[PDB]
């Protein structure tokens, strides 16, 4: 069947928004008076770096970004020319709540206001090309419960998107300060294992769903359920 073209070197840019220090949030926003620094997030940034460099992307890391700073960054890559690129990736590592992610200042950036900056109209050099977003953040403060089981041509403006959420809405996602987050670490492991095999991203994200689903938070009897969304029209593979 149809497969997105993926032969350019580099494949495209891989943005990494890596939020660790939330002192501004603790100071300015009363609601987030005790929101914690995201210790161990560099383990995700590093794993993402290693993984997508192996997949021939050019990594563009940005540390400790407020909401306005994130917007500025996205607007820059929105206005850039991706004509010689076959793909675009944006990884966000931060705190969040339902439908949003927090900047280090504790302000809110709705996820749709992030992804929509790279629609075909707003970023024509990425038209027809896969745009992939990975969001590592909570989407609420609820613990996901567990359940027992037995062991020319015109296309839509919002085409070719892939949104990989670390969790379903309303619920938390986990970060091990000594290992990284459940979602990102699992994602990078699956990518590095299955991309050389030629597996597509939906298959890999399915495996990620399976892997994270088997992890437990024994302190609160919590689980985590990642949730991909996509408008992809072709199979997405990352040759190596």
């Amino acid at each position: 069947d149809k497969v997105y073209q993926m032969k350019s070197k580099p494949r495209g840019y891989c943005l990494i928004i890596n939020n660790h220090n939330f002192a501004k949030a603790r100071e300015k926003v009363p609601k987030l008076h005790s929101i914690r620094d995201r210790n161990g997030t560099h383990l995700d940034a590093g794993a993402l770096t290693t993984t997508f460099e192996e997949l021939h992307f050019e990594i563009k890391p940005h540390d400790d970004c407020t909401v306005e700073q994130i917007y500025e960054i996205l607007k820059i890559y929105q206005l850039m020319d991706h004509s010689n690129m076959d793909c675009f990736i944006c990884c966000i590592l931060s705190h969040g709540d339902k439908g949003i992610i927090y900047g280090t200042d504790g302000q809110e950036a709705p996820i749709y206001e992030l992804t929509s900056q790279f629609t075909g109209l707003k970023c024509p050099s990425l038209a027809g090309k896969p745009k992939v977003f990975f969001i590592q953040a909570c989407q609420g403060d609820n613990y996901q419960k567990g359940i027992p089981v037995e062991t020319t041509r015109y296309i839509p403006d919002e085409a070719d998107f892939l949104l990989g959420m670390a969790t379903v809405n309303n619920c938390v996602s986990y970060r091990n300060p000594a290992e990284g987050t459940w979602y990102i670490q699992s994602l990078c492991q699956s990518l590095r294992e299955r991309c050389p095999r030629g597996d597509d991203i939906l298959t890999i994200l399915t495996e990620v769903n399976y892997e994270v689903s088997n992890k437990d938070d024994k302190k609160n009897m919590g689980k985590q359920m990642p949730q991909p969304t996509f408008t992809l029209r072709k199979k997405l593979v990352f040759p190596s």
């Binding site: 161990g40 909570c138 938390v172 986990y174 970060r175």
Partner: peptide, 4 residues
């Protein structure tokens, strides 16, 4: 374990 911590949450985001």
């Amino acid at each position: 374990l911590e949450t985001x």
